[PDB]
Amino acid sequence: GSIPPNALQDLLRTLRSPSSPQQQQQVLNILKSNPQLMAAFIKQRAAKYQ
């Protein structure tokens, strides 16, 4: 058994999509919209103050 969800991929897919630094503004809002991704992502993002 090894198959990730499709919904979670959509959220992260946003911040993953190769777009200008401007679109990044959307990523922030997406982070919160991502559960399992929030915890993991926090590692790098939240690391901003680590």
Binding site: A47, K48, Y49
Partner: protein, 45 residues
């Protein structure tokens, strides 16, 4: 995510490394913006 280590959380977990190549100040604006400090206290949906 409960006996997995290969779920969506791990999918971006890799590429996420690129995040390290971003301003630390900018990340703070997005963090405090939504306040992930409390979003990490509980998660389930």
């Amino acid at each position: 995510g409960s006996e997995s280590q290969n779920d969506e959380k791990a999918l971006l977990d890799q590429l996420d490394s690129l995040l390290s190549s971003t301003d630390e100040m900018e990340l703070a604006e997005i963090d405090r913006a939504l306040g992930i400090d409390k979003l990490v206290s509980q998660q389930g949906g």
